[PDB]
């Protein structure tokens, strides 16, 4: 097709060179424009099996786990499960009148409770280690006010999203949320009858290696797996959540509401949001070492920006993701390696396509 053939050539153009350029072995990458899916592979998801990529490879998201964990919350908050004004120790009944009790929902969603890291300490492993970490959390920054992207905070919230559903938060979405939005093959633990299509990820030595799955925040912040058919399934969904039953179109809607804005970002439920159209330059900031790594002064919104794009990257140690979409112009894009490439490249990479492809 005529239009199959231009979108591999942009593909080839501008997500083709990264592979040599960072010895990577394996890439998906897919695009959906008014409702049509198109998807291009390239390479080996098992380098040793001699496994090519294909529609059933599965890559580990990274961070655009976080989404999920975000839909998830704005599926509880829509059913009155929760709301984001509450506090944990309300459902994580220990955690009543601890310091953390002064956090609400949204603040630990959006990384706002003014002490939590990217990581939780090296030593924080067990259920029991993990609940005496947020018991003796104190605060530091005026909480609220200062963003420091975390996995425990994220984690935090997909904890009580779970208790609030009476669910382990894998089932939440395994059971619940995937299924809502038509995905047949994303997982928070792959089973046995789908391990031979679970690629290996690559490190920068090349040996094949997959993601350990730590304390309680590794499935709300890192640890969900997924196909690229199934992440276009999810920026069809939130291209087009009219479409959806009630119960998931208000939870991809809720995801969609900026929250607070730093800078020219503006952080919404897990996804990071933007005016559209965007510069380059504005969503390569977004992953700048100074917004990803340090707290930065948050800013409530004043408008709502009335044409919004949103974006998010994602990494496990073995692999890349890259998720866009623009509403107004129906189209967007998923980018999966079986090796980390560096987000801007990603980034780039992506803009030159979404750019290029005519009307
Ligand atoms: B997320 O992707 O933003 C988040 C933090 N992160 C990691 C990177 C990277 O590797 O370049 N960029 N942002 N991802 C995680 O925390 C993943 S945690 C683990 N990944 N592999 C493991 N074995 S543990």
Redesign the pocket.
């Given at each position: 097709t005529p239009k199959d053939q231009e979108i591999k050539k942009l593909v080839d153009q501008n997500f083709k060179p990264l592979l040599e350029k960072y010895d990577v072995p394996g890439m998906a990458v897919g695009v959906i424009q008014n409702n049509k899916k198109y998807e291009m592979y390239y390479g080996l998801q098992s380098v040793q099996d001699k496994k090519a990529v294909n529609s059933s490879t599965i890559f580990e998201l990274?961070?655009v786990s976080k989404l999920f964990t975000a839909t998830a919350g704005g599926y509880a908050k829509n059913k009155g499960k929760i709301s984001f004004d509450d506090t944990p120790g309300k459902y994580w009944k220990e955690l009543k009148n601890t310091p953390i009790d002064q956090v609400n929902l949204l603040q630990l969603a959006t990384y706002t409770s003014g002490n939590l890291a990217?990581?939780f300490p090296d030593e924080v492993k067990t259920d029991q280690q993990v609940l005496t970490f947020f018991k003796d959390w104190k605060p530091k920054n005026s909480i609220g006010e200062y963003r420091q992207?975390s996995?425990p905070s994220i984690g935090l919230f997909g904890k009580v999203v779970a208790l609030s559903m009476n669910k382990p938060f894998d089932q939440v979405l395994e059971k619940t949320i995937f299924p809502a939005l038509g995905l047949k093959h994303s997982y928070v633990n792959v089973p046995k009858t789908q391990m031979q299509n679970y690629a290996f990820g690559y490190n920068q030595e090349n040996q094949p290696?997959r993601?350990?799955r730590?304390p309680l925040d590794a499935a709300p912040?890192?640890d969900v797996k997924s196909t690229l058919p199934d992440m276009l399934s999810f920026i069809h969904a939130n291209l087009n959540p009219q479409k959806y039953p009630a119960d998931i179109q208000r939870a991809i809607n809720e995801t969609h509401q900026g929250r607070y804005q730093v800078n020219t970002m503006y952080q919404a439920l897990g996804w990071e949001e933007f005016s559209y159209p965007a510069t380059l330059q504005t969503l390569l900031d977004s992953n700048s070492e100074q917004i990803?790594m340090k707290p930065n002064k948050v800013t409530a919104i004043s408008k709502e920006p009335s044409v919004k794009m949103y974006h998010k990257?994602?990494?496990?140690?073995?692999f890349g993701t890259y998720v866009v979409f623009i509403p107004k112009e129906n189209i967007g894009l998923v980018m999966l390696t079986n090796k980390?490439i560096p987000?801007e490249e990603r980034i780039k990479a992506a803009y030159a396509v979404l750019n290029a492809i005519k009307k």
């Open positions: 990274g961070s990217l990581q992207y996995n290696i993601v350990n730590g912040a890192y990803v990257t994602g990494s496990t140690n073995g980390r987000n």
